[PDB]
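DATA SHEET
Item: assembly model
Revision: 1
Owner: S.N.
Input lines:
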Amino acid sequence: KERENQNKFERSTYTNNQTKDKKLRAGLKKIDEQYKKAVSSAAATDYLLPESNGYLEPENELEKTFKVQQSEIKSSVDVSTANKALDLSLKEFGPYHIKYAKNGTHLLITGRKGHVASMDWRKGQLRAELFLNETCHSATYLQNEQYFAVAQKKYTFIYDHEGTELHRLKQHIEARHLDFLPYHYLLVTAGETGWLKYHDVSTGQLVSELRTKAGPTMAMAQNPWNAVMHLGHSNGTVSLWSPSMPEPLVKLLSARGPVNSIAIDRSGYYMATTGADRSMKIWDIRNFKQLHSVESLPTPGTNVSISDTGLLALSRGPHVTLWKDALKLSGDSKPCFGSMGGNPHRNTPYMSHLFAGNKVENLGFVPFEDLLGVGHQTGITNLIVPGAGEANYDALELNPFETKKQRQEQEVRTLLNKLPADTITLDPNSIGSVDKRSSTIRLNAKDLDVIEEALSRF
Amino acid sequence: SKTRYYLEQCIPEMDDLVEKGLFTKNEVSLIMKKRTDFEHRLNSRGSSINDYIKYINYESNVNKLRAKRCKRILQVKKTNSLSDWSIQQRIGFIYQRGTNKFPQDLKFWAMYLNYMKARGNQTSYKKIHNIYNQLLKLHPTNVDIWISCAKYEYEVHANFKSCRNIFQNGLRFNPDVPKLWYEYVKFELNFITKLINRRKVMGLINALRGDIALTIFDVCMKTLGKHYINKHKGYYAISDSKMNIELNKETLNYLFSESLRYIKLFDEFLDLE
Amino acid sequence: MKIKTIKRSADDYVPVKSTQESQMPRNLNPELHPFERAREYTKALNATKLERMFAKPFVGQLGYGHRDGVYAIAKNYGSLNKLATGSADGVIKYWNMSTREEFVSFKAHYGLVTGLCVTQPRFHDKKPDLKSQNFMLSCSDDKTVKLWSINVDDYSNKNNEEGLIRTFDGESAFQGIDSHRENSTFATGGAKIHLWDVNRLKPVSDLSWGADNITSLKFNQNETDILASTGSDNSIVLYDLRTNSPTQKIVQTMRTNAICWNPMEAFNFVTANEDHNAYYYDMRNLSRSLNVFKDHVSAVMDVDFSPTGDEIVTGSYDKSIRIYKTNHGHSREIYHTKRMQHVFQVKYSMDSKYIISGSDDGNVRLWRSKAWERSNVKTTREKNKLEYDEKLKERFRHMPEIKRISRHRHVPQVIKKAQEIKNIELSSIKRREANERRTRKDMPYISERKKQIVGTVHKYE
Amino acid sequence: PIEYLLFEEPTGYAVFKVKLQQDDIGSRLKEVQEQINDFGAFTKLIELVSFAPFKGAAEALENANDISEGLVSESLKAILDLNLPKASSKKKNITLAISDKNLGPSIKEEFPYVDCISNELAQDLIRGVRLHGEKLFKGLQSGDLERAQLGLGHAYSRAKVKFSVQ
Amino acid sequence: VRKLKHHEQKLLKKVDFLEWKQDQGHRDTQVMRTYHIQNREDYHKYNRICGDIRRLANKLSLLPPTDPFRRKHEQLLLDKLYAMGVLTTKSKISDLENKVTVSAICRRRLPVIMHRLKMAETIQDAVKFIEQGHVRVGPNLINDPAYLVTRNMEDYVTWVDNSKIKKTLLRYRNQIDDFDFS
Amino acid sequence: KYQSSAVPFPFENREQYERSLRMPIGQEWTSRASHQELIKPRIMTKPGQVIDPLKAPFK
RNA sequence: UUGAACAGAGAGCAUUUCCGGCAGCAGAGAUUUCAGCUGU
């Protein structure tokens, strides 16, 4: 009943800053008993969890972890993971924006010149290779490998599984950043116009057009927790947006200069933003505190990414550098680059790699595996990062081994339980409650000159 | 899914089995992933009684390892907590599930009965009675189950009334195999021999005869003759009197050969008259 | 340097043999499953919409009805599918509700058959053959109570002189009848309420409070020796058969059309009366109703309890029936039909799943108590989905978007217009009593549950 | 309540135990009428508790004639006395569902504590187990049921017509 | 996407992954499958032209019917749209909303007039021939199919000489002169 | 419109009412046993047999 | 409606009546488990 890992499974509630009703008293007592039983029994599943997370540990004081080479990892790990660590050398079209499907089964690469390829990177099956000879910028899958949206010269296009064009969106005028919201079925679009557009993929209907009013959108990320969009502008300002409010939900002053990249944890708690002022900044999202401010990077961080197990992958051109346990509150988790004299209270890099020829275009962790796919000027490279993936997925949220029938039925079922775009709030648990107006107690309709003293009476 | 239900029914015993400091978390996760494999193979499609049997063998092996580790770590022979009966209860439930799914392999039914009998004082003889009742309901014609049921309830419990009831019900169902007749006359001779030997013993310390065996001998001859004349010449009596007398002669040969075997294994009961 | 990656191994996740299903590993982290309020809000909304499209409650009418409108119905409380109905032209019929067809019809009387019930007649010379004969008895305004037997094909044990085994006789007319659930006894109300047993051809006892007639009668179902009756002086009288006497009566504002006792609580009953609502009364304290079920718009003609004791059905003179949860006090459901006129009798079948209504065009109709509920047997996946959806609609019940959908029905034009003028009338009298209370000194706050009792014999202390 | 079910067939006798009652009032509805066609829901109603197979085609023909003319044979007596609980004869008999309204009297003549039902509910329960057949029996009979049906039909017909091969 | 069940057709009806509201019935896709347009955005760079001429025809309708600036510019626009052959006659200014079509401004393209005067036999083979570089309008070769013609140049659509399909049709009719090198 | 207008009847304040709503009963968020305990209804009848009135041990 | 003896079912409910403690010893089945006497 005690369960040393309950507070992961606990659930916050409302507080005022007991009752005389017998029936209501016993009803609330049954509700508290059921909540305790449910938390305990849900937290006892960690016995049933099949796999264990990966790691790499130094076992010596001369053996630092950032100086461990990718060939040495590929020798030290098994043949299946060594074959997952792919490398495509696609030289002639431009730097390749990488994208993985939400289970790690499909890869979607876009060249800057025109070359968009959707493929099953772990078999050898490509299912779309289309050369759209205008400058493409980004792409994403929608709810499947079966549809993907590409952001072209101006218009965003939507292609089916084999690459036939389904849609040319006449809105979404100049996208540079696309991201799909999978529980809400919303393709979110931002770019050189100062506008943020939410487009419902299922109905086909443009849900929202929002003026950023801050020029072109330099970075864009999605909170996986509550589906609000963090856009980074040329002010050094991140703004958190929802498709209901025509104003940003929050505006944070992250950096000086512009904001080069944003990444959010999948728990929706931490956000790493890199500015062009050579400054990485780790942010608390829920309480909006600034946790860490790594200033004076040697060159501006062009990308950040956060794995499912909380690694932090920063990329500064040729270099990729990953820190472990950097998204924590304490000042001993501030990511350093060296430990001055061997200080154990300095978060040196967990591992680093140098793409010596080129400058990396973007970063993306492969979802349920221990790999980091970085797309760069001459194609794709996966890196075996051992701490970097949820070993125990849930197979009824999203399954890496899913079949054709399972894809069909899961598509219909998630389409059926698509969440409305109005339910996107800054916290997800605020659509069962009562108003923050409409008084917290329910109402019971019962509650619904001594002369002048004489001259008074006149 | 129901594999999820069974797998999370398995968790309180390993709660207790980690608290009693004999197993660790990394090895109990290994026994849970093996048990996950087995539960999924059990309640998925295309299932096999060999999947049931291998699950029972795995659960008995982890029970023996648990007993060995308990004696080596805690130096007691049972912790008198949940984790010393839960796994035998699991084996009994795997047996019950398997016999409800494939009630056709008497090898598995008899492995169930053997494990349930050999469980010892912890089981209940009415729990053995229940699975004898449903097995005899499903296989009334298979006669070795009747012999085994009555043999368990006479040669272990010495319950003469219930043993007589079992033999009379079996002879009601299949009064055609002579083996059940011979085991009934064997049981009646054993019962009357134990009766007269307890008489001799109470005499030496301090009416009811083999005529029961003779009467069941008489109805054995009559009904075995009737069932052989009904079994051979099967559909109709379309046979002339040559074939009818040939048949009746052959049933006399059959029945008299069985009575020859009756006297041949009747001579060795030499403690009564 | 030690090193370990994720080894997925493909034997645990995609099965070896093709005949068996794939493994579904679970991981109960809320990080893995993010939108836990919105996702089950949308499942509760899709459950309310699925209920509003699956609501097909009309099963079928049974037989061809009667000729002159059904004024009496009685289920038998031991068999599931048998039903006796009588009309205004004196014909009674016994029904198999499985095949929806009459076992037998009977020209029983000449007037209206004003009551009928069913019996297991405890004769002490003969033995009742209840596996092949059913027994219904029935009183009319031609001063007769007649007892009939029915040949029933429900067991195949046997292989016969069906109708009218005896004829009780009164000097004045009868108006209601109900049978005791043991000991050969019944009671008939009329010009005066008499008790009878099936052996004697005359009333055992006359149990009348005063010289005011009796319009309806119900025996209790447990504590079977407690009777209740409705008299046309707006009176509800309780009788006890140990003391062989009346017990206590109350006088209300308007006339109680019917009673039914709670089969699970043994001292609670529900009255159905002419101001358009029903009253849930405790026998041990008749000074206050313990519920009022309000949503009808004309005089409530008949009420009945679910055999689970948890909800009531209530048919009224506006041509519609209404089902009420017992703890709420407003209608959970309304059933209407352009063909159904003036539902005079409603029973709740012993399955607790179907509702029998007898209208006055002639027809007796089956309905589902839960409209969206089908009567097949269910695999565990669909049974689990259905009770998950019930719990989810229950805990999101009061959200405005799903409340406006679950609250929605199509009511006829006449009932809708009477409903809205009833609303503006009630709002006007609340406005005027608020003004009068603002001025005057001592205006007592009378409860709604007491606002309909004009008085009570044997006062409470 | 339709508690037990007796299905006669050429391989022997089967006693099933009714788990869930089907609907009585909604017995003519569409879902109730096609749940006996779906096997995944019929196995929620019916469970096999006993099957006594015959001793051969001779006892098969004897029991086919006894079932045909509505009599309880000795194998019927054995399996019913094994399977049905010793209920009372005056209060709450055990309920057996048959398909033959003139076999019912022969069953109550032998077991007075058994009331027998063959109305439309027992009829469609019986035709559910006829529709599915070999799947309900879980593998416990020798001999294919249609092959025994061919043999028993030919034997019954030649007996009824007195077919002589002379 | 799954040909949804009935409680499915009812619960969500406006879902359609294939055809949205703003597709306008996929008329761009339909007319470029008809007249076989190579790249995208040609439809909309014709539709902008159609919208511009109906907008300035609207504001020429706005101006009063007496001034020579208005009447000279509408007769000039009508004569230029006749001179590029978008129209077939010099009729009413109501035809500048009834008869100007993105279809007809595709009718003036070079492969479709080629199929019209039977130089090719299908528009696809016309685009084959003019990507292979066989034809010319007057002196100069035409490589792209986006060159639409004017009303004067439907007479000098001819192949080049040394075009071997021209040589094959000459040796078909065995009028094949070879002093003129084709 | 995704949050209720006032506090519904059986509760007295929104702390009580949101303590009712604080745990999801879904398959995805509870174990299988806890999911079954949370979704079984209060009134469980048998689908084809008669419900008789209650009888108590001597009232 | 009760009482009596008889035949039972495994389908319910208590509670300190004993056992799931240790040997010595013979017995039981295939070197492991199984079955009772004298005291802790």
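QC remark: The radius of gyration of chain E is 23 Å.
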